[PDB]
Amino acid sequence: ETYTEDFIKKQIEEFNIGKRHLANMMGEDPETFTQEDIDRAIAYLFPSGLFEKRARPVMKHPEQIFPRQRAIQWGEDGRPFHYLFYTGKQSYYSLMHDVYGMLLNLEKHQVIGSRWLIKEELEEMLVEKLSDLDYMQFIRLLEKLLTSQCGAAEEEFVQRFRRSVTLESKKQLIEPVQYDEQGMAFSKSEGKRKTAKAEAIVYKHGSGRIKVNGIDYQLYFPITQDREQLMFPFHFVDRLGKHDVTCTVSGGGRSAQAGAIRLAMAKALCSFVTEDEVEWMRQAGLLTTDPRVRERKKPGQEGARRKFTWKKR
Amino acid sequence: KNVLKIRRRKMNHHKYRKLVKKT
Amino acid sequence: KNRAARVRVSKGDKPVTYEEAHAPHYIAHRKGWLSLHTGNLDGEDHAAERTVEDVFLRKFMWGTFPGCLADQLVLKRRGNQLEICAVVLRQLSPHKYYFLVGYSETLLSYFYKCPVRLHLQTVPSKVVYKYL
Amino acid sequence: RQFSYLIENMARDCGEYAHTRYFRGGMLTNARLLFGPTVRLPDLIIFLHTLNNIFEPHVAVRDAAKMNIPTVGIVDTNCNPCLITYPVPGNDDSPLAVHLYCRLFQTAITRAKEKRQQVEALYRLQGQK
Amino acid sequence: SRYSPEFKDPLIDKEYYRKPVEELTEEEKYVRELKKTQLIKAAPAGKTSSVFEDPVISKFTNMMMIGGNKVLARSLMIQTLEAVKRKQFEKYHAASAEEQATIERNPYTIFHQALKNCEPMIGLVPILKGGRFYQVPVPLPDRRRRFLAMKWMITECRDKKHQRTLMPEKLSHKLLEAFHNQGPVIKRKHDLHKMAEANRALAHYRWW
RNA sequence: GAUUAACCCAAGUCAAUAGAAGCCGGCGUAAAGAGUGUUUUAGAUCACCCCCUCCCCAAUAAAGCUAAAACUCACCUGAGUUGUAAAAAACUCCAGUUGACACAAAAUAGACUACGAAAGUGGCUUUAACAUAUCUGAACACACAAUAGCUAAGACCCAAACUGGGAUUAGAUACCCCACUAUGCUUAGCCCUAAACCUCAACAGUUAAAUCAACAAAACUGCUCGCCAGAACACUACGAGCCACAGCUUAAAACUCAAAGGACCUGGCGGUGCUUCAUAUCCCUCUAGAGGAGCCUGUUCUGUAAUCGAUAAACCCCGAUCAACCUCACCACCUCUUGCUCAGCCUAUAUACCGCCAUCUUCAGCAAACCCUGAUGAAGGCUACAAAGUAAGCGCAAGUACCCACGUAAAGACGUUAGGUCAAGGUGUAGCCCAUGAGGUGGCAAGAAAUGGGCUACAUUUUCUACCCCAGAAAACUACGAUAGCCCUUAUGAAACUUAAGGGUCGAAGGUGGAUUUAGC
């Protein structure tokens, strides 16, 4: 399905007329009608619940919709425009030629936030199909260019093939410190373990009292291991007997409830400890939601993993 | 090459020697 | 190997529509439902009766517009209204399409005791999604 | 590969074409499939080295003959000139030899294109008057 | 696993974190700045920062657990540790001032030493050779030595020879026997050593 | 075979038989260079011209000799030695050290490539000694000819057919272990055979043209002798010759067949090599099970007048998310005939099929259209410092669902097993039509036995009660242990010794289960 320039030009004329129609339908100014408004209006007028968004109704600009097509690479006389046409990879080899030429001129003269573009992004800048070894050879040639004393002209070029990657900080978020009617500072957080959901209120000052659904923690958790879980966050930061806690937990069993409270208390306790202590709690596994939940049973087998006995042959 | 032609002669000669021994 | 509602790969010469090209696991993901009614919602009744009616209307329209249907029917129910939306070809004369619309809407309205409307969308040829 | 950069530049400067990279099967004998039914093939192929990197004849020597394209080629003492239309015995290894060849062909091509414009221009001026 | 490979195990050790910066080496400084960028698994609901945490006893307890019944497994463990301590206090009060010095009353010291006295130094692996399987003496890694000491202790207490004796009384009695290099679990170790000795000539059959 | 039509020839047609129709081709692997050399009569032109590897290295015969290792004997020490995947038998005047000591065999050199006609010849010395001043040439002769074998007389370390013993095996007339003979050695005579093959004849010459079926050790010219002409019968029969007497050489025919044969391609397979790995996975390892008991359930057998299908992996709580009547397709009896249907059929055929699936798949490949390689054969198509492949599409992948980007689902092509299903429904072909169709009544669906899956147990990490984890009791013939048996009640139903639930009574096997085996990261 090749698409000519005349075909795309007609598709853009339709999109601009339809863009004004869509704005007229919704009673909005056609001049200030953006692509975000188009998507909102199309989702209302043509509601689709299909799980894959690519299968849903779309009214995008032709440039966004249609794929990139290389233009004709020769004229009426049949002479190709580019001197590397007969390689079949004129854009790739023209780039290798340009990078190789810069490496030569340097000799005559003489990380965290960025990555190399992937093969599928190079294959779009060039508008050609590339092998994996072609991609490697090009990257090996760019790396060889950074190690050299590349100037400003040789730095704008390398940055074209570098894509900024947004590292996400692992630093734990801190809850706001609130104040009650009596003026006592406290923090509040939540935790989930299996099907248990907990919400804990940790007071800045206290004597070590913990109330779980209004009950003393040792009466609510008669099993000693459930109480060790409540001790774990405070003990790890040397704050046993320094805070009062009132928490509520629902769902799950006794152990899942102790785990949900442990996570809720640890997150809320992060408001009253130093930043270095919060990173130690994170590295100790006290601030991570356990993703381990029951696996579904599959049909045709006894359990989530166990298979029916392989019958004796 | 295979030895299939030799094998035919091998058996012929074996059976002949045994026949001569028997008679 | 799974067979259900799968048009199988060939030599690249078999035209399939969008409906035909998607196996059942794509239902509700890439393809929608061909009939929409409330019988299969939680707490709703008469799903069996809506299903029988749908099977009939599909067979009925196949034989009432023989060789004219270019895709599956889309069945819509709102209140007691029944809307039949069909994509048809442009071979039969328009007089015959008006006869069959009047005939089908009337006959189906008396059969199922509900107002039935037939909406025809014509295409020059069967719309091809891909060649398997 | 020692002269890939030099040869690619010589082609661009004279307004011609260079293929110094790995030669994929069928660039010439299957060009219509690879490039398109209206692709125009070269009218002349000039080999500055007739051997590939395993010391065998470049596949395009055979394929140029298959497509009935005349070939000019520098043929060293270890090369096979049978199928080269216009072979030129000469050293293909020394940079001084290879640079000379590029100067000569570049100069021959550049002069011939300038001559074509001179003749055409004169033929037009005289035509009007 | 529901954890992507990127998730690292949590390090639960208060001392590891309070250690001053100056004491740190350039290698240990890099590991600490690295972990600040890594994903950390949630701490399992077993091990905590408590000072009364013993990884060996927690492991022995899990090897006693039947069908996920940790409460019962933990109950038996603490009853065994209490039964060991009470038996030693009784031997201590009934002893003379001289013998009292040699009587150990810590059940954790007895438990650890009892297992170390049952760990086998050599092992035997079956090897197929010439159509007959041969038992062959082979060194055992430290992990395997510790596991076998525990598995033999639990197996002995589960033996039906014991009639109506509760596990805390059986296990406590077996630990104190092994603590004194006596009992059936020590004999099981000696037998493995005697069988490995008698198969000394077959050591060469090993290829690793 | 009949029949219709057609085709060929035609007063002929054509069944049987016979004849006509054949030597300038070959001989590394398809048949074929005869085990080797040398004549005559002859043939050749490779003989005069015109020329370059004489001597020495492991030819041959004879005589003499011996360094290493054995055997034997002797002294002194030891209690074992031998045998190996592991054993037994065997020896124990045995073993180890040292010394004396061959009619046997000839490390290293030898990575040399020599000698001889071939067969053969590789320790040392000496004697004799290696034809032909054109070439080819004896299957009508002559002289040779490995190993084995024969005759006679000797030697005898070691090896060793046969034989005996040991072991293995269903058997073991073998392979493995021990012992020992003929025999291998010498002398004197025979025998005259080898995959006697470097399966490639001697002499002379060439490297250009067409290089050339394939493979092998590139393709040919001149000349000559020998040999070959489908397979098998047949290294055979007969005749003849021979020191040969179960021998050797020469060597057919009848009957039989449409092949046999040579070399390759692809695939499969290999108790197939190397390398690297498997990740609940092959071994070891980890945990809980099955295999033992009772019971539940399927199947096989047996039984019954009394269905069917699945039935190695990939059947066996499978079609059934389900049989007291019904369901039902089965059996017995009775009844109806245009029949609920512009009839009907659960009748045969899943080896005619659609449909929906199993299986490898816990895979990543399939492939149109081109292009190129192989002399334009079956076939094959890659090396990134790249050498002929380009590849739409399909699958994987990606996306989506579920709690994430993880996991689990889902997905998973082309093909494989004529895999499953005509009894889901539909349907090709064939068959039934007063019956192979339709209806009614009643009935079967059991257990000598075997087996698969499961359930509950054999108990103290237990049993009962309270509680839902700080308790009290129980704990071996009144314990643990049946969801079984028997009796009663209830529920559903028109119908219940029959199905389910509860109660009472009863208190059995079982005391943790061999070989083997299942599941889980």
Ligand SMILES: [K+]
């Ligand atoms: K006649």
Ligand SMILES: [K+]
């Ligand atoms: K012969």
Ligand SMILES: [K+]
């Ligand atoms: K040698």
Ligand SMILES: [K+]
């Ligand atoms: K020698």
Ligand SMILES: [K+]
């Ligand atoms: K040979």
Ligand SMILES: [K+]
């Ligand atoms: K093969």
Ligand SMILES: [K+]
């Ligand atoms: K069992």
Ligand SMILES: [K+]
């Ligand atoms: K079972």
Ligand SMILES: [K+]
């Ligand atoms: K089928």
Ligand SMILES: [K+]
């Ligand atoms: K059917």
Ligand SMILES: [K+]
């Ligand atoms: K049928």
Ligand SMILES: [K+]
């Ligand atoms: K009882």
Ligand SMILES: [Mg+2]
């Ligand atoms: Mg389970």
Ligand SMILES: [Mg+2]
């Ligand atoms: Mg072979």
Ligand SMILES: [Mg+2]
């Ligand atoms: Mg024969």
Ligand SMILES: [Mg+2]
């Ligand atoms: Mg499947």
